Amino acid sequence: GAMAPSYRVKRMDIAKNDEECVVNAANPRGLPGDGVCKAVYKKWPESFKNSATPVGTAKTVMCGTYPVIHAVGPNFSNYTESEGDRELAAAYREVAKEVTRLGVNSVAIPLLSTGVYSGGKDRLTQSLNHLFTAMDSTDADVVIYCRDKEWEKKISEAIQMRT
Ligand SMILES: [Cl-]
Ligand SMILES: [Cl-]
Ligand SMILES: [Cl-]
Numbered sequence: 610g611a612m613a614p615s616y617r618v619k620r621m622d623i624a625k626n627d628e629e630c631v632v633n634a635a636n637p638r639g640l641p642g643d644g645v646c647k648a649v650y651k652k653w654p655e656s657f658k659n660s661a662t663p664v665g666t667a668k669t670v671m672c673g674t675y676p677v678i679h680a681v682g683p684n685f686s687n688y689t690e691s692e693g694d695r696e697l698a699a700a701y702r703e704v705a706k707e708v709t710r711l712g713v714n715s716v717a718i719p720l721l722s723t724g725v726y727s728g729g730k731d732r733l734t735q736s737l738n739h740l741f742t743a744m745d746s747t748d749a750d751v752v753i754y755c756r757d758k759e760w761e762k763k764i765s766e767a768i769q770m771r772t
Contacts, residue, residue: 614747616753617750620757631653638661684725704716741771
């Protein structure tokens with residue numbers, strides 16, 4: 610585990626992370642996709658061998674010795690707000706189990722269901738709070754990746770409020 614487990618946020622491509630493993634914001638079919646998923650496919654294509662997994666779950670596939678944890682958040686265009694909230698919380702709980710099982714000291718994670726699976730709604734707080742609920746009991750250093758300047762400021766504020 611990390612000596613003093615922390616949360617940090619960086620505004621950059623998660624494919625350039627400086628952590629011991631990465632969480633892909635995957636689709637259930639293991640396809641290259643778009644956004645974070647397409648960047649992950651270009652950087653670690655070998656990790657997409659048998660990576661298909663249902664909504665609400667996470668499946669890890671190794672690229673060399675580097676773990677890629679494919680986590681499938683719900684697409685809010687298809688789920689109700691109630692059922693989607695439950696599956697989004699569940700995907701993050703499965704990421705925490707995988708990070709623990711892998712024994713890594715750090716993990717790079719995106720905010721699941723906040724891009725093309727958001728159903729056109731701002732889900733920063735919803736997704737980040739489910740990330741904290743799952744990851745708080747792990748001892749890995751967590752580094753959250755985002756691309757928008759206003760999102761970086763809001764995520765940073767939410768991390769600092771708890772310290
Ligand atoms: Cl970048
Ligand atoms: Cl998304
Ligand atoms: Cl973003």
